[PDB]
Scaffold this motif. Structure first.
Motif, PDB file in Angstrom:
ATOM      1  N   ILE A 186      -2.208  38.887 -17.027  1.00 58.69           N
ATOM      2  CA  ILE A 186      -1.911  40.318 -17.034  1.00 58.69           C
ATOM      3  C   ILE A 186      -3.005  41.085 -16.301  1.00 58.69           C
ATOM      4  N   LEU A 187      -4.261  40.770 -16.602  1.00 58.41           N
ATOM      5  CA  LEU A 187      -5.411  41.390 -15.944  1.00 58.41           C
ATOM      6  C   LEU A 187      -5.888  40.561 -14.755  1.00 58.41           C
ATOM      7  N   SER A 188      -4.972  40.255 -13.834  1.00 56.72           N
ATOM      8  CA  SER A 188      -5.332  39.435 -12.681  1.00 56.72           C
ATOM      9  C   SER A 188      -6.208  40.206 -11.701  1.00 56.72           C
ATOM     10  N   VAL A 189      -5.915  41.492 -11.502  1.00 53.32           N
ATOM     11  CA  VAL A 189      -6.699  42.300 -10.573  1.00 53.32           C
ATOM     12  C   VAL A 189      -8.129  42.448 -11.073  1.00 53.32           C
ATOM     13  N   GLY A 190      -8.305  42.574 -12.389  1.00 57.47           N
ATOM     14  CA  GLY A 190      -9.650  42.628 -12.940  1.00 57.47           C
ATOM     15  C   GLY A 190     -10.429  41.351 -12.698  1.00 57.47           C
ATOM     16  N   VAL A 191      -9.770  40.201 -12.859  1.00 52.79           N
ATOM     17  CA  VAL A 191     -10.421  38.920 -12.595  1.00 52.79           C
ATOM     18  C   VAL A 191     -10.812  38.819 -11.126  1.00 52.79           C
ATOM     19  N   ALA A 192      -9.898  39.206 -10.233  1.00 57.42           N
ATOM     20  CA  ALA A 192     -10.189  39.143  -8.805  1.00 57.42           C
ATOM     21  C   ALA A 192     -11.350  40.057  -8.436  1.00 57.42           C
ATOM     22  N   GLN A 193     -11.371  41.273  -8.985  1.00 61.22           N
ATOM     23  CA  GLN A 193     -12.446  42.204  -8.667  1.00 61.22           C
ATOM     24  C   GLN A 193     -13.777  41.737  -9.240  1.00 61.22           C
ATOM     25  N   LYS A 194     -13.768  41.146 -10.438  1.00 59.71           N
ATOM     26  CA  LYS A 194     -15.008  40.603 -10.983  1.00 59.71           C
ATOM     27  C   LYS A 194     -15.525  39.455 -10.128  1.00 59.71           C
ATOM     28  N   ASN A 195     -14.624  38.596  -9.645  1.00 60.47           N
ATOM     29  CA  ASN A 195     -15.044  37.539  -8.730  1.00 60.47           C
ATOM     30  C   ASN A 195     -15.629  38.124  -7.451  1.00 60.47           C
ATOM     31  N   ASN A 196     -15.018  39.193  -6.937  1.00 64.27           N
ATOM     32  CA  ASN A 196     -15.514  39.818  -5.714  1.00 64.27           C
ATOM     33  C   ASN A 196     -16.898  40.430  -5.910  1.00 64.27           C
ATOM     34  N   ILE A 197     -17.119  41.110  -7.033  1.00 71.11           N
ATOM     35  CA  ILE A 197     -18.346  41.882  -7.205  1.00 71.11           C
ATOM     36  C   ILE A 197     -19.505  41.042  -7.737  1.00 71.11           C
ATOM     37  N   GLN A 198     -19.222  39.949  -8.440  1.00 73.22           N
ATOM     38  CA  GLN A 198     -20.287  39.173  -9.052  1.00 73.22           C
ATOM     39  C   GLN A 198     -21.147  38.507  -7.979  1.00 73.22           C
ATOM     40  N   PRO A 199     -22.424  38.261  -8.273  1.00 72.22           N
ATOM     41  CA  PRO A 199     -23.285  37.585  -7.297  1.00 72.22           C
ATOM     42  C   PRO A 199     -22.740  36.212  -6.938  1.00 72.22           C
ATOM     43  N   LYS A 200     -22.867  35.858  -5.658  1.00 70.02           N
ATOM     44  CA  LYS A 200     -22.373  34.567  -5.197  1.00 70.02           C
ATOM     45  C   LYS A 200     -23.292  33.425  -5.608  1.00 70.02           C
ATOM     46  N   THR A 201     -24.584  33.699  -5.777  1.00 71.86           N
ATOM     47  CA  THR A 201     -25.544  32.700  -6.219  1.00 71.86           C
ATOM     48  C   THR A 201     -26.433  33.302  -7.295  1.00 71.86           C
ATOM     49  N   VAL A 202     -26.963  32.439  -8.155  1.00 74.68           N
ATOM     50  CA  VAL A 202     -27.920  32.833  -9.182  1.00 74.68           C
ATOM     51  C   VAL A 202     -29.276  32.269  -8.779  1.00 74.68           C
ATOM     52  N   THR A 203     -30.217  33.159  -8.475  1.00 79.46           N
ATOM     53  CA  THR A 203     -31.558  32.778  -8.061  1.00 79.46           C
ATOM     54  C   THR A 203     -32.574  33.641  -8.792  1.00 79.46           C
ATOM     55  N   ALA A 204     -33.792  33.112  -8.926  1.00 80.74           N
ATOM     56  CA  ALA A 204     -34.846  33.835  -9.628  1.00 80.74           C
ATOM     57  C   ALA A 204     -35.228  35.132  -8.927  1.00 80.74           C
ATOM     58  N   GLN A 205     -34.857  35.291  -7.659  1.00 74.47           N
ATOM     59  CA  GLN A 205     -35.170  36.489  -6.894  1.00 74.47           C
ATOM     60  C   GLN A 205     -34.100  37.567  -7.011  1.00 74.47           C
ATOM     61  N   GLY A 206     -33.069  37.348  -7.822  1.00 75.82           N
ATOM     62  CA  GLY A 206     -32.017  38.330  -7.978  1.00 75.82           C
ATOM     63  C   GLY A 206     -32.475  39.555  -8.747  1.00 75.82           C
ATOM     64  N   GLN A 207     -31.651  40.602  -8.674  1.00 78.74           N
ATOM     65  CA  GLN A 207     -31.967  41.876  -9.304  1.00 78.74           C
ATOM     66  C   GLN A 207     -30.857  42.433 -10.182  1.00 78.74           C
ATOM     67  N   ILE A 208     -29.645  41.890 -10.118  1.00 81.77           N
ATOM     68  CA  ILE A 208     -28.510  42.397 -10.880  1.00 81.77           C
ATOM     69  C   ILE A 208     -28.144  41.361 -11.932  1.00 81.77           C
ATOM     70  N   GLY A 209     -28.218  41.755 -13.202  1.00 81.36           N
ATOM     71  CA  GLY A 209     -27.808  40.869 -14.269  1.00 81.36           C
ATOM     72  C   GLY A 209     -26.311  40.633 -14.268  1.00 81.36           C
ATOM     73  N   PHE A 210     -25.912  39.491 -14.822  1.00 81.13           N
ATOM     74  CA  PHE A 210     -24.498  39.135 -14.771  1.00 81.13           C
ATOM     75  C   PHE A 210     -24.143  38.203 -15.919  1.00 81.13           C
ATOM     76  N   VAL A 211     -22.893  38.293 -16.364  1.00 81.19           N
ATOM     77  CA  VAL A 211     -22.357  37.433 -17.413  1.00 81.19           C
ATOM     78  C   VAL A 211     -21.329  36.505 -16.782  1.00 81.19           C
ATOM     79  N   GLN A 212     -21.522  35.201 -16.960  1.00 83.44           N
ATOM     80  CA  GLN A 212     -20.623  34.180 -16.442  1.00 83.44           C
ATOM     81  C   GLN A 212     -19.989  33.442 -17.610  1.00 83.44           C
ATOM     82  N   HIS A 213     -18.670  33.269 -17.544  1.00 81.91           N
ATOM     83  CA  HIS A 213     -17.903  32.675 -18.624  1.00 81.91           C
ATOM     84  C   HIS A 213     -18.221  31.189 -18.773  1.00 81.91           C
ATOM     85  N   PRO A 214     -17.994  30.626 -19.962  1.00 75.22           N
ATOM     86  CA  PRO A 214     -18.180  29.179 -20.149  1.00 75.22           C
ATOM     87  C   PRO A 214     -17.096  28.397 -19.423  1.00 75.22           C
ATOM     88  N   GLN A 215     -17.507  27.618 -18.426  1.00 73.20           N
ATOM     89  CA  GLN A 215     -16.581  26.812 -17.635  1.00 73.20           C
ATOM     90  C   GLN A 215     -16.351  25.498 -18.370  1.00 73.20           C
TER      91      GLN A 215
END
Ligand code: SF4
Ligand code: SF4
Ligand code: SF4
Ligand code: SF4
Ligand code: FES
Ligand code: ZN
Lengths: 118, 98, 182, 48, 689, 63, 85, 56, 92, 279
Positions: free
Chosen positions: C31-60
């Motif tokens: 139902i919330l497919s657009v929300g999932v797509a937008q979260k995938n678009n906006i979330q950081p592509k990589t997680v590195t110690a030099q990042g600046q934006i916090g993020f929550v990633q679901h349990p895969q």
């Protein structure tokens, strides 16, 4: 030096010696001592809860070794056999009454131990 | 014109979610810059929400009565295409609500 | 070893630093497919110690969660949780601790239940898990551990104190001419 | 036989409940008017 | 002159010539003990604990106060440095009282942590120690002045950070006392941070006094909600009880300071709590019920009540998830208005984050040159922002005011107390108009309370035209100085989702009070209106409600908050809500499913998917999304009303320590109100500054 | 789980765990643990060595 | 001796202290010695004048007046008064 | 009254490390592994000598 | 005699709710030690600084603490922070 | 300006002491505060001749003195009132046609408080909007100022009213202080500034009052004689005035024994009298 039953001592004036510093709680190897502190209305620093789980106590003497005011000690009483696990759950009431009962012999033994380096 | 004036009663909310520095949102961003105050003046009491993110896809969400959402993709759409999409959204209310 | 050497791939595997895109598999997520797509678009592509934006990633929950030991017949609740990964500096009360903190990423699970059992007023935690936080030398190591054990991760990045010009000559700076300032 | 006092003392240290009114009360419209039970007094409200 | 090379323990290191020895050592991972040098205070050489050995110099050199000399060799691990540190430690511990067990600093004491590592190990000062009578600073600072080490950190903090002048060294020799010469209290709205800056137990947190020890606490990083700045904090708890709150380093928000409400109003969550759903009878008797019964009753009322008679109230402590849940649930019932109070509404459109946020961010005051307050009192609304503004005014910042003459710690011009000055500036026939014109960076800070006035929209338009015509919003220098200092995190979150606060239901028969407890009047709710209250404490909303649904506090839920500059901060679950209380979004989801309009959220993950559908920027935490429509949103428009009443512009906060339900339900805040309110109350300004 | 319990406690708080390893020989385990700690600290127990207490009581433990 | 204010009624805040008109003419010369941006320097001469005109002792009200005159903190005036014997 | 040398200045904390390349490695193989000699640029005396000089 | 929670009472009793009966402490702190130490009178010492060890010898009481009897107000009783004893100057 | 004499002489000597508030104002500080009050009234449309009813009760001496001196500077008429009930307050408001009413909210008007009495007399204050001009029954009632701590709708705080104007960006202009402009309406008679100055001179010459001698005014300060012998005397001849509103005679005697020769304006139900210097 015999490590018997945990007990709380008091000053000769009647004021309890414990200052709620939780050093015995930190030093207890089996974490059997639970201390909760609230300042008394007069302004002193005293325990509102001082519980020792005699079922979780290994009778090692670290509480009396770590006490800076010699409040918690281990009296010679070894006939502390109880019929209830709840009876084995000592609290501040029981510790204070036990220290009141056993203060003379505890005082004598502690005096002798103090005089050894003195 | 007429459809712009009818936004206040045809819809309940219009949300524009896009990106600041992407070619996908260029048309939607330009249309919002050019035509925001026309719609706002024509519909002073209508919710016209604008939200932008770093990499969000261009979406125009039309919210009709009873919370019926009609998000529509608007990526790589010219200002004419953006206007056509909005006009379609302000013309589906009779069909959507019934 | 808080900072892996970004100049060389030997820092950590690129697959570990990747943040997989969410795939809608639940009815609400469809139902919330657009929300999932937008979260995938906006979330950081990589997680590195030099990042600046916090993020929550679901349990895969897939073959990556294969190496867990907490999916017990008596415990079906641990292997779905979201930990918090952040560098915990020393508290503001003291500045020169005997054991300094801030050299490791703390991974902390939220408290599921805490209540005082009444006979002795004793604190009991209904979940023996999450009692003590884990510590990892590297954010990449923490993320790899989360992926192996099937934990989601809320990563927040440290905020360090800014460098400042310090000198004792600043205590005796000349104010200036009275007439000029007026 | 006095365990409930001790349990309430335990609970009140971190999650003391709100004493809801019990019985008839003054209504100013939809609001029930009951005096505040705070032992502290706002002296700024009673001064000069 | 740019990149010199020094030697630390024989290890070459490239450093800048402006560094101190301590900074050069710390940048290379060499820890040097210190007691007086604070990384955010002026450098002083009171203690000598940072003395280090340097080759080819006879005296030990204070590492914190001495700059780096090119080609120098610093020997921190040498036996000479060990001897220096041991001597300094022995002198520090000579007159120190044997009070570690009775002192709250034990387990987190720099003196202990340095004597255990850098001290000699044993004492030889077998003499009478000096004794100093303890002082009375108020219910927040517990003083044991015999434990002081004369490091002047408190004095420097008060003079340089807080801005108040009430601490200093009186006398000389070994009888010097560090405190107020006369008997006065330490009330500066930052009174809790001198405890943090005191390296010893001389200044300790009085509410936290004696309660616990550092080794028995678990710390969680979270975000404050007591102020709209959302200061990053560390909450230390022992089991189910929250023990203390401490500042956290965040240069973008609050540096390393927090206010008293942030630090000392957390205990308001430990009393007057709501732990079970309750229903109110006709006579007013409250009965505890089950969740199922309350949900069924509210669902029945929602089903039978017409949509046009359904209203809601959004409280202060309403987060993104809760507001999203309520908005979607009311939309599914065709409800489009989320406010029932017709007086006290914010006249700011939710169309643009540029419209409803501080566009210059907290660092703007540091960046800007001229600051203009319009009905804003940063001393109470945001004490850490007030300290930052003071720091900026020290260098090159000029502050003007068009509101109530406040008692800010710095100098500020007073343009007036009414809107006449604003009208004159908008017309341009005011001396301050040229001051804004010539300013490199102008900035305007208008309170949300000021924008909530009856002529709120007119005041907003006047401020917008002032900003456009003067240069506050300039594309030439890429500056957007228009800033609105909000007063409710709930209002900020509601604006961030697209809820218009001006949408008011004149006659509402079903009212959802979503934790609202301030600005609530008995005539704002009809006498025949069914009321549900999603509350945490019972102060007003419990009395205004037919049904009370307990909720989770900000420390009792995983929530997303919007710092007024626009920051997305993630408040974390520290302790579960007491009793059977549930977080608001779960309650709303259950009610929606029971009402025949289920919401597509089984978990916080799906709820945040919905949030991303609404506003994706809310999923980027501890980040400010740049707004490219600042000038488009805040552009002056022809024909919009700008008529302003000549009534004075006022600041809403009367009692700083009691502004919300949690603050009013706090024992520490009650003591603060009893102690400091009369001392900090003055109908006339402090001319002496 | 004595090893895990020791790892979850400071050095001295885990010292009594060695008494219960070999409750027949309760002081030799203490001696081994203390020697491990001393070796980690790079020192020796001069007082214990010069008072002959450790060797004497270890031989009593052996008996 | 003591570094703190004794709780004496004769040295309370209600005690009056105003500089004599001759002293008010005297402080003008004292202020002229130091730069106008540094009126803090005159604290010691002002304390000396107070001691001259107040029975060879400086009261707390006099310290308050000196702090108010020189636009300097009262705590700083107290520190100056206590530091010197 | 003598407290300066209470803590032991000298401690038995000395650690010594010995690292050795594989015994079966030849000179040219080690030069190639260390990068001073190229892989296929072998069997040339001048290049081997230059790599050896750089390694030394 | 004064009502607790008032400004004067709080300022006097270290911003704490003073209890005269001390049986409230007997309940909350599980000990009548507050009453037992209230029975003990004030000790008057000539010197400006007194030393308290809790007893007659070292290790028989609490660590040595030095109490300043030279206060802002003359003859102000000062309580030991390890024991409950109170000390004051001989005259003022 | 008639009141700028001692301000021009030195400006640093103490002028008025508020013992009940422990606040000491020099001539510079007093001038700054009174100018702030005058500019605050001027910015709120207070033209000359507008009425302000002083309902403040004894204790708030500083606010009363500041209001009096500012009304003298601003040119608005100041009328003390002694309303102890809602009916009395209504009658005073109707008769005086007051534009503003300055009150102390927490003072006891019998069973009720002053703020509650004002709310009962003026029911439109409860529903008055934030920042909006009040729509009251009274024809010319426009401002209700209170020296309290909390915020009441329809009323504004004393500090919120005042405007501390600057030397550069100020636009408001204060009219010249007029001797002939009415300043006091006490006992159904009008006192002008010149009349108050004449009364001050007469009481100075007839009560053995020097240029440099403290005057302790006890209790209420709203009386015209109290104003003349207190702050007005300080502004004219530099006499040090000490206000002891709502203080017992023992405390007054203590704070007088702190001084050498104190003229004791004794508080009473009738207009304040005076006694001999010192004891
Ligand atoms: S003897 Fe040891 S185990 Fe028992 S209570 Fe004391 S410290 Fe704990
Ligand atoms: S070590 Fe002694 S003084 Fe400290 S808390 Fe334990 S019993 Fe009390
Ligand atoms: S400040 Fe407290 S913990 Fe630190 S050395 Fe002093 S008494 Fe001990
Ligand atoms: S009171 Fe604390 S912060 Fe102040 S000088 Fe003493 S040790 Fe330093
Ligand atoms: S830290 Fe350098 S002298 Fe104190
Ligand atoms: Zn003692």
């Amino acid at each position: 030096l015999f490590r018997g039953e945990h007990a709380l001592r008091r000053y000769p004036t009647g004021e309890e010696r414990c200052i709620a510093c939780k050093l015995c709680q930190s030093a207890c190897p089996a974490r059997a001592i639970t201390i909760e502190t609230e300042p008394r209305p007069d302004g002193s620093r005293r325990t509102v809860r001082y519980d020792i789980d005699m079922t979780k106590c290994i009778y090692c003497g670290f509480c009396q070794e770590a006490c800076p005011v010699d409040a918690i000690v281990e009296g010679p009483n070894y006939e502390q056999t109880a019929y209830l696990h709840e009876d084995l759950f000592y609290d501040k009431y029981k510790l204070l009454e036990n220290g009141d009962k056993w203060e003379p012999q505890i005082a004598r033994n502690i005096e002798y131990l103090i005089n050894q380096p003195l | 014109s007429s459809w712009q004036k009818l936004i206040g009663t045809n819809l309940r909310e219009l949300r524009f979610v896009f990106c600041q520095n992407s070619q996908r949102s260029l048309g939607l961003r330009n249309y919002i810059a050019k035509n925001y105050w026309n719609l706002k003046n024509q519909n002073p009491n209508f919710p016209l929400i604008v939200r932008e993110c770093e990499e969000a896809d261009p979406y125009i969400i039309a919210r009709y009565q009873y919370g019926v959402e009609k998000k529509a993709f608007a990526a790589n759409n010219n200002e004419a295409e953006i206007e056509n999409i909005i006009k379609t959204l302000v013309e589906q209310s009779n069909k959507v609500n019934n | 070893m808080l900072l892996p050497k970004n100049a060389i791939q030997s820092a950590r595997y690129f697959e570990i630093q990747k943040i997989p895109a969410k795939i809608a598999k639940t009815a609400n997520e469809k139902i919330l497919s657009v929300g999932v797509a937008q979260k995938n678009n906006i979330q950081p592509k990589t997680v590195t110690a030099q990042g600046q934006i916090g993020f929550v990633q679901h349990p895969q929950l897939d073959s990556s969660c294969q190496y867990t030991q907490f999916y017990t017949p008596q415990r079906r609740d641990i292997r779905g949780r979201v930990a918090r990964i952040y560098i915990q500096d020393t508290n503001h009360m003291h500045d020169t601790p005997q054991i300094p903190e801030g050299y490791k990423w703390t991974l902390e699970f939220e408290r599921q239940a805490q209540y005082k059992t009444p006979w002795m007023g004793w604190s009991f935690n209904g979940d023996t898990f999450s009692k003590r936080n884990h510590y990892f030398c590297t954010l990449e190591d923490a993320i790899s551990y989360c992926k192996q054990m099937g934990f989601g991760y809320e990563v927040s990045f440290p905020r360090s104190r800014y460098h400042t010009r310090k000198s004792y000559a600043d205590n005796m700076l000349w104010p200036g001419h009275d007439n000029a300032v007026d | 036989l006095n365990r409930m006092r001790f349990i309430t003392a335990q609970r009140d240290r971190s999650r003391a409940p709100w004493q809801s009114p019990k019985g008839e009360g003054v209504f100013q419209g939809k609001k029930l008017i009951v005096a505040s039970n705070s032992p502290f007094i706002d002296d700024m409200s009673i001064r000069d | 002159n740019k990149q010199i090379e020094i030697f630390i323990d024989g290890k070459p290191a490239k450093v800048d010539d402006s560094y101190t020895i301590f900074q050069a050592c710390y940048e290379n991972g060499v820890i040097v003990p210190r007691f007086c040098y604070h990384e955010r205070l002026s450098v002083a050489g009171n203690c000598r604990m940072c003395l280090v050995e340097v080759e080819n110099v006879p005296k030990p050199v204070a590492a914190c106060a001495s700059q780096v000399v090119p080609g120098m060799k610093i020997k921190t691990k040498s036996e000479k440095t060990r001897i220096h540190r041991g001597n300094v430690m022995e002198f520090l511990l000579a007159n120190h009282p044997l009070d570690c067990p009775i002192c709250d600093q034990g387990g987190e004491c720099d003196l202990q942590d340095i004597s255990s590592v850098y001290g000699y190990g044993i004492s030889r000062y077998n003499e009478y120690k000096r004794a100093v009578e303890d002082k009375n600073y108020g219910p927040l600072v517990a003083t044991s002045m015999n434990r002081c080490i004369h490091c002047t950190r408190c004095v420097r903090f008060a003079t340089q950070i807080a801005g108040v002048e009430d601490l200093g060294k009186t006398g000389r020799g070994k009888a010097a006392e560090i405190g107020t010469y006369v008997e006065k209290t330490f009330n500066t709205e930052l009174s809790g941070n001198v405890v943090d800056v005191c390296p010893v137990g001389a200044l300790t947190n009085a509410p936290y006094a004696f309660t616990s020890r550092p080794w028995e606490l678990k710390s969680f990083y979270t975000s404050d909600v007591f102020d709209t700045l959302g200061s990053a904090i560390q909450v230390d708890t022992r089991g189910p009880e929250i023990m203390r709150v401490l500042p956290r380093i965040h240069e973008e928000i609050n540096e390393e300071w927090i206010s008293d409400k942030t630090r000392h109003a957390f205990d308001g969550l430990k009393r007057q709590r709501i732990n079970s759903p309750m229903k109110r009878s006709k006579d007013g008797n409250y009965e505890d019920i089950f969740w199922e019964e309350a949900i069924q009753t509210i669902s029945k009322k929602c089903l039978n009540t017409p949509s046009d008679q359904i209203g809601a109230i959004i409280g202060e402590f309403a987060d993104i998830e809760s507001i999203t849940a309520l908005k979607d649930f009311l939309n599914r019932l065709d409800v489009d208005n989320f406010e029932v109070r017709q007086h006290g509404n914010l006249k700011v459109s939710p169309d643009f984050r540029a419209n409803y946020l501080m566009n210059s961010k907290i660092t703007g005051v540091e960046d800007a040159d001229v600051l203009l307050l319009v009905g804003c009192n940063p001393r109470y609304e945001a004490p850490v922002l007030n300290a930052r503004i003071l720091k900026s005014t020290r260098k090159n910042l000029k502050v003007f005011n068009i509101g109530t003459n406040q008692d800010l710690n710095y100098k500020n011009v007073h343009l007036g107390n009414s809107t006449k000055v604003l009208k004159e500036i908008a017309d341009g026939t005011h001396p301050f108009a040229e001051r804004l014109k010539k300013a490199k960076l102008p900035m305007i800070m208008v309170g949300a309370s000021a924008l909530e006035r009856e002529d709120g929209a007119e005041l907003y338009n006047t401020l917008k035209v002032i900003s456009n015509k003067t240069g506050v919003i300039s594309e030439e220098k890429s500056w957007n100085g228009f800033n609105i200092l909000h007063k409710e995190m709930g209002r900020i979150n509601a604006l961030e989702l697209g809820i218009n606060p001006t949408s008011v239901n004149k006659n509402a028969k079903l009212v959802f009070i979503l934790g609202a407890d301030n600005n609530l009047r008995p005539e704002d709710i009809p006498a025949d209106a069914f009321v549900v209250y999603f509350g945490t404490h019972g102060d007003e909303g419990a009395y205004y409600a037919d049904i009370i649904l307990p909720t989770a506090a900000y420390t009792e839920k995983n929530a997303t908050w919007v710092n007024t500059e626009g920051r997305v901060q993630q408040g974390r679950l520290v302790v579960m809500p007491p009793g059977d209380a549930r977080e608001d979004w779960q309650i709303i989801r259950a009610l929606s499913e029971e009402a025949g309009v289920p919401l597509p959220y089984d978990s916080l993950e799906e709820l945040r998917y919905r949030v991303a559908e609404l506003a994706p920027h809310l999923l980027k935490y501890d980040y400010i999304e740049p707004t490219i429509f600042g000038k488009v949103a805040l552009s002056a428009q022809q024909g919009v009303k700008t008529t302003l009443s000549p009534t004075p512009i006022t600041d809403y906060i009367d009692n700083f320590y009691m502004t919300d339900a949690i603050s009013r339900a706090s024992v520490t805040m009650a003591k603060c109100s009893t102690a400091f309110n009369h001392e900090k109350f003055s109908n006339f300004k402090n001319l002496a500054k | 789980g004595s090893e895990k319990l020791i790892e979850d406690r400071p050095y001295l708080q885990g010292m009594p765990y060695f008494d219960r390893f070999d409750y027949v020989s309760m002081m030799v385990q203490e001696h081994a643990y203390c020697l491990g700690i001393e070796s980690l600290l790079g020192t020796t127990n001069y007082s214990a060595t010069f008072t002959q207490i450790r060797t004497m009581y270890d031989e009593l433990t052996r008996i | 001796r003591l570094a703190a204010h004794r709780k004496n009624d004769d040295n309370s805040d209600s005690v009056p202290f105003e500089f004599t008109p001759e002293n008010y003419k005297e402080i003008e010369k004292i202020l002229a010695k130091y730069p106008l941006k540094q009126k803090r320097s005159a604290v010691m001469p002002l304390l000396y004048l107070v001691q001259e005109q107040n029975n060879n002792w400086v009261p707390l009200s006099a310290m308050k007046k000196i702090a108010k005159l020189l636009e300097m903190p009262e705590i700083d005036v107290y520190e100056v008064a206590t530091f010197y014997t | 009254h003598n407290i300066r040398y209470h803590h032991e200045i000298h401690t038995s904390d000395q650690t010594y490390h010995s690292s050795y390349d594989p015994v079966g490695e030849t000179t040219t193989e080690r030069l190639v592994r260390y990068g001073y000699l190229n892989k296929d640029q072998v069997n040339n005396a001048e290049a081997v000598a230059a790599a050896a000089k750089e390694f030394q | 005699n004064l009502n607790p929670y008032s400004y004067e009472a709080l300022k006097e009793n270290h911003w704490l709710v003073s209890d005269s009966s001390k049986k409230n402490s007997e309940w909350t702190h599980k000990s009548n030690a507050e009453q037992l130490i209230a029975k003990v009178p004030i000790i008057y010492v000539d010197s400006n600084i007194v030393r308290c060890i809790g007893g007659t010898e070292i290790n028989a009481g609490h660590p040595q603490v030095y109490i300043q009897l030279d206060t802002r107000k003359h003859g102000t009783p000062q309580t030991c922070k390890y024991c409950g004893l109170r000390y004051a100057k001989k005259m003022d | 300006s008639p009141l700028a004499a001692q301000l021009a002489i030195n400006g640093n000597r103490n002028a008025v002491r508020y013992e009940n508030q422990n606040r000491t104002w020099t001539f510079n500080e007093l001038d700054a505060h009174t100018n702030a009050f005058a500019y605050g009234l001027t910015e709120l449309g207070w033209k000359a001749g507008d009425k302000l009813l002083l309902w403040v009760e004894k204790n708030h001496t500083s606010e009363i003195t500041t209001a009096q001196v500012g009304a003298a500077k601003a040119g608005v008429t100041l009328v003390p009132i002694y309303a102890h009930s809602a009916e009395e307050l209504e009658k005073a408001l109707n008769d005086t046609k007051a534009k503003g009413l300055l009150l102390s909210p927490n003072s006891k008007a019998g069973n009720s408080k002053y703020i509650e009495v004002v709310n009962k007399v003026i029911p439109e204050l409860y529903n008055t909007g934030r920042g909006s001009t009040l729509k009251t029954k009274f024809a010319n009632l426009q401002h209700i100022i209170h020296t309290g701590f909390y915020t009441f709708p329809g009323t504004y705080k004393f500090r919120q009213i005042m405007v501390y104007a600057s030397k550069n960006f100020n636009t408001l202009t204060l009219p010249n202080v007029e001797l002939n402009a009415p300043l006091f309406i006490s006992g159904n008679q009008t006192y002008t500034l010149k009349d108050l100055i004449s009364k001050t001179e007469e009481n100075r010459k007839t009560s053995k009052l020097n240029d440099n001698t403290p005057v302790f005014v006890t209790g209420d300060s709203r009386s015209p004689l109290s104003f003349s012998l207190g702050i007005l005397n300080s502004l004219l001849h530099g006499n040090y005035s000490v206000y002891t509103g709502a203080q017992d005679l023992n405390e007054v005697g203590q704070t007088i024994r702190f001084y050498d020769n104190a003229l004791l304006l004794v508080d009473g139900d009738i207009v304040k009298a005076t006694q001999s210097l010192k004891h």
